[PDB]
Amino acid sequence: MLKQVEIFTDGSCLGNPGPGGYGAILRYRGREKTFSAGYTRTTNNRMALMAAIVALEALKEHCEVILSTDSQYVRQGITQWIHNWKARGWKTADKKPVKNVDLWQRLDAALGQHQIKWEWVKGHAGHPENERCDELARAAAMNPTLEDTGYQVEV
C-alpha cells in the first residue's frame, strides 16, 4: 500500500484550435488541490491531456491514483492507442509521428510513476468534482493567459 489520492481532470476549448483551458483536482484525505490554466490557441484534446499531466506531476511520491475523467480522447487513447504506440516507438502504422506526442509521452511518463486506476465518466453521471473541473476549464478557456507552444498549428 502506498497513498490513495483521487484525481479529477477535464479539458475544454472554444474552438479547434482556439482558446482553451483545463481543470484538475487533486484530493487526499479531505485535502484538495486545484489546478487550472488557459491558453490562447490550443485544442480540446491537448487540454484533456494537460489536466491529467498537471495533477499527476504534482505527486511527490508513488500513489494509488484514481483518475476520473469524462474525456473521450484520453479514454480512447489509453485503452486503444497507447499500447500500440509504445510498440512502434511512438509512430503511426505508416512510420509517421503521432499527434500530440509531446503530451502523450509526458502523460505516460507520469503514469508509470504510480498505480493508476481509470474511471471513465459516462453519460455525465460524474461527481461534483468532475463538474468543478469543467467549470475551471471553461473559466480558464475564457481568460487565456499563456500560449500552448507545444501545439503544432494545423490552422
Binding site for Mn ion (CB under 5 A): 10, 134
Minimum Å gap between C-beta 39 and Mn ion is 16
Q: Contact, 20 vs 11, CB < 8 A?
A: yes
Kindly tell me which of 107 and 137 has the beta carbon lying closer to Mn ion: 137
Closest CA to 47 of 64, 55, 86: 55
Kindly tell me which of 114 and 132 has the beta carbon lying closer to Mn ion: 132
Minimum Å gap between C-beta 151 and Mn ion is 19
Phi-psi region of 131 (alpha: psi -120 to 50; beta: other; left: phi over 0): alpha
Minimum Å gap between C-beta 73 and Mn ion is 11
**CA distance linking residue 36 with residue 24, whole number of Å:** 6
Minimum Å gap between C-beta 66 and Mn ion is 18
Minimum Å gap between C-beta 83 and Mn ion is 25
**CA distance linking residue 84 with residue 113, whole number of Å:** 20
Kindly tell me which of 10 and 148 has the beta carbon lying closer to Mn ion: 10
Position closest to Mn ion via CB: 134
Kindly tell me which of 11 and 17 has the beta carbon lying closer to Mn ion: 11
Kindly tell me which of 134 and 148 has the beta carbon lying closer to Mn ion: 134
The residues, ordered by sequence, that sit 6+ positions from 12 with a Cβ below 8 Å of its Cβ are 20, 21, 22, 23, 44, 47, 134, 137, 138, 140, 141
